[PDB]
Design a protein around this ligand. Structure first.
Ligand code: HEM
Length: 153
């Protein structure tokens, strides 16, 4: 549960990611790969990128960042009523990609790091706390679906 006011600060800052979705997606995955290299091991398509210059050059890394943030935007706009948007994600991530929950935590922190670097002016103390609670609900709900799916890391 976030208040209505919190959901508003979340959608507001989300408006700035939507003015450049692939741009922000690409830096989130770089921040993630740079910050927890082990996460790169889950991506066949990218385990061959050896440096930040190669990641930056990567057209497919950019398309995938786009995918990720377009999926996450759809969830956020639901303001917590996102079961339907969430299921399919939990099903592939658990069964197919075998992504532990800690990895969800890693990407949540890269998302916040990107918004802080790119929009300091808009991403003050209030927007920061609201976005954190929004990503923390997303992860708690993903963890529970995992659980009913019979998994979890
Ligand atoms: C904010 C959290 C995330 C979102 C919204 C998200 C979204 C997606 C979407 C929409 C797809 C494509 C359709 C599907 O397979 O479900 C995808 C595929 C994938 N995801 Fe995620 N993801 C997230 C986090 C993660 C993390 C943290 C990892 C790895 C450490 C990861 C690994 C993968 C892989 C390996 C694929 C298939 C990539 C390919 O085409 O080879 N995801 N993700």
């Amino acid at each position: 549960g976030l208040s209505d006011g919190e959901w508003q600060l979340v959608l507001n800052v989300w408006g700035k990611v939507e003015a450049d979705v692939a741009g922000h997606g690409q830096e989130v995955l770089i921040r993630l790969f740079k910050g927890h290299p082990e996460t790169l091991e889950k991506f066949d398509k990218f385990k061959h990128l050896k440096s930040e210059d190669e990641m930056k050059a990567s057209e497919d890394l950019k398309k995938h960042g786009n995918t990720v943030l377009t999926a996450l935007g759809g969830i956020l706009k639901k303001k917590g009523h996102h079961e339907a948007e969430l299921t399919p994600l939990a099903q592939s991530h658990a069964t197919k990609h075998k992504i532990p929950v800690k990895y969800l935590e890693f990407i949540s922190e890269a998302i916040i790091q990107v918004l802080q670097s790119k929009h300091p002016g808009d991403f003050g103390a209030d927007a920061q706390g609201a976005m954190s609670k929004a990503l923390e609900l997303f992860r708690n709900d993903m963890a529970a679906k995992y659980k009913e799916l019979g998994f979890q890391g």
